Structures are given as C-alpha cells and as structure tokens.
C-alpha cells in the first residue's frame, strides 16, 4: 500500500510509455492490447492503496490476535 | 500532400508509434531563415533546413510546444502550421485555425461555451437531479 500511497500517477504513466515502446518493437510478441495500458487514476490509486493498507492492517492484527491467544490458551 | 523537407535527424525512440498509422498523426511545417539546431519534442537535437521544413509528430501538444516555445520564442519563426493527418490520407490544417494566432483577438470568431453569469451563480446539483444537466451547463 505504501507504494500506491507514496508514489503518484505521473511517474508510472511515463514508465508505462517506455514499456509500450518495448512491446511494439519486440518481434515474436504477437499480442497487442485492445485497451491502451495507462497508469491508475489519481483517485483510483488512493482507493487501491487504502485497500492494501486496510487488508494488511486487518490480516496482520488478526493473525497476531488469534496466535497470541490460542497459542497460550485453549 | 504536405510539402517541406524533414530536419536532419539520426533517429530516436520518441517518434511515431502504431497510433500514427492506425488512428491519427500530426505534421508541423515551418520556414526558417537559416540552418540551425533545435530540440525535438520527444528528446534529442535535430537540424532544421534552410528552406521549408516538415516534421511528423505523434501528438498535437508536440507541435504547439515546438512552434510556440521554440519556433516563435527562440527562432522568431511565426509561419508554422500544424496539420492533422488521418490514416486514409485526409489532412486538415488545425493551427492556427483561421490564419490568426488564438491569443490575438480576430473578428468573426464566435463565442463558444460561454456562460452568461459568474461562476458562483451555478445551480446546486440537487435542483438538476435526474435531468441529465450539469450545473455549469444549466441555462
């Protein structure tokens, strides 16, 4: 989540453009995008980063809560 | 067809891609008083010719940046034009639209997307619910 929350869109859009060039110039790569690959939008990145942050928050404490209690008790 | 000779350029990776052949392309043409070095819109240095020049560019912003920030500001060249070229060969001149630069007021230009009020008088979105009209588009 820290990646989605700290780094912002314009960095990734420029990087994706470089990968777009690489794919177009590489032989034997017959695939081609039907939807043009773009970096996630500004709002979308905040939501995605928040989702990873929350899921990691819940999973980490949930595992610790169960293990530190069940491991010490019934 | 568009006349003019391309600037001296050894090649680069910032040029045209599949979009140029599939959807649309842009060409900027101008005339210079001498042979001189300018910066390509997507990196690198190119040498513009003595006569009339012609450069193929992927996006319209490349032509506006090159013509405005380099041709006019630095080389004092004001006769540059930008064309939109479609894959079927149709070419239309888009900059300047009417032969006069947009920053200079010209007679005959109509008002487009003008709102006859201050921005603070836009109606609230609640009054336009389910009407399909945005507050800035409200009469």
């Amino acid at each position: 989540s820290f990646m989605f929350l700290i780094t912002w869109r314009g960095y990734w859009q420029e990087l994706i453009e470089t990968l777009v060039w690489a794919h177009e110039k590489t032989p034997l790569s017959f695939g081609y995008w039907r939807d043009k690959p773009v970096a996630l939008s500004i709002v979308q990145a905040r939501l995605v980063g928040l989702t990873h942050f929350t899921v990691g928050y819940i999973a980490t404490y949930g595992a610790f809560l169960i293990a530190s209690t069940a491991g010490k008790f019934g | 067809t568009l006349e003019g000779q391309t600037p001296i350029f050894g090649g680069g990776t910032g040029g045209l891609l599949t979009k140029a052949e599939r959807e649309e392309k842009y060409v900027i043409t101008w005339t210079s008083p001498k042979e001189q070095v300018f910066e390509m819109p997507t990196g690198g240095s190119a040498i513009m010719r003595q006569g009339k020049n012609k450069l193929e560019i992927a996006r319209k912003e490349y032509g506006i940046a090159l013509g405005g920030q380099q041709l006019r500001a630095k080389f004092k060249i004001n006769d540059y034009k930008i064309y939109r070229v479609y894959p079927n060969g149709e070419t239309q001149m888009i900059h300047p639209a009417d032969g006069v630069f947009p920053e200079k007021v010209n007679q005959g230009r109509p008002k487009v997307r003008y709102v006859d009020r201050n921005i603070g008088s836009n109606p609230s979105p609640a009054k336009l619910k389910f009407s399909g009209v945005q507050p800035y588009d409200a009469p």
Binding site: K36 | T18, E23, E61, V105
Partner: protein
C-alpha cells in the same frame, strides 16, 4: 472530452489562451469588459485537462473552468 466554460467575469487578459498547451482557447470580440475581448473554447476535443488556463486566470474566482469528463485518446495525452 473535457468541458471548458468561460464566465462573464472574464477581463480579456488572454493569459489562459497563451498558457494552453494544445490550442483549445482563442480570444473573440466581446463588449462585457474593458479589453473588448473574451476567452472561448472552440476546440475542447483537444483539451487534455492540464488546467494551465485556470492557473493563469487572474480573476477571483476563476473566469475559466475545466470540468474533466469522458476520457479519449487525446484527452489522456497518449502518443500510442
């Protein structure tokens, strides 16, 4: 495409037109201000939404507003 609107508080300073990187705006004759001109947006299909015009607008509040809308190839600034 994005939507660019010009309100009557415009003073015809032509700053927004000069700042546009894709030639969306142009100055048209008008009578509502001392400069006798007002900004217009005939070519919003080429608008990328950079909002450079809003940054250049000196009026308070802004006389030119950009409302991001449906995204196209050229509104996303895609060279591919």
């Amino acid at each position: 495409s994005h939507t660019v609107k010009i309100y009557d508080t415009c003073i015809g300073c032509t700053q927004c037109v000069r700042a546009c990187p894709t030639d969306v705006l142009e100055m048209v004759p008008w009578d509502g201000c001392k400069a006798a001109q007002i900004a217009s947006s005939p070519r919003t299909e080429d608008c990328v939404g950079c909002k450079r015009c809003e940054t250049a607008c000196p009026t308070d509040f802004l006389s030119i507003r950009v409302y991001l809308g449906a995204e196209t190839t050229r509104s996303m600034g895609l060279a591919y």
